[PDB]
Amino acid sequence: MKLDEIARLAGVSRTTASYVINGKAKQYRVSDKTVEKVMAVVREHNYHPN
DSSP: OOHHHHHHHHTSOHHHHHHHHHTOTTTTTOTTHHIIIIIHHHHHHTOOOO
16 A cells, blocks of 8 residues: 555555645645545555655
8 A cells, every 4th residue: 555556546646645645635736626536545545644
């Protein structure tokens, strides 16, 4: 469950997915569009920000 697979499984990039993993989406530029998109993967796999 690495960051790259979470990005492919969700549909973003190595760091864009990280935004969702770290809970910083709104800070960067994925306010909600990627939140449900990428969070659904981060939380379904239970991957934490590291």
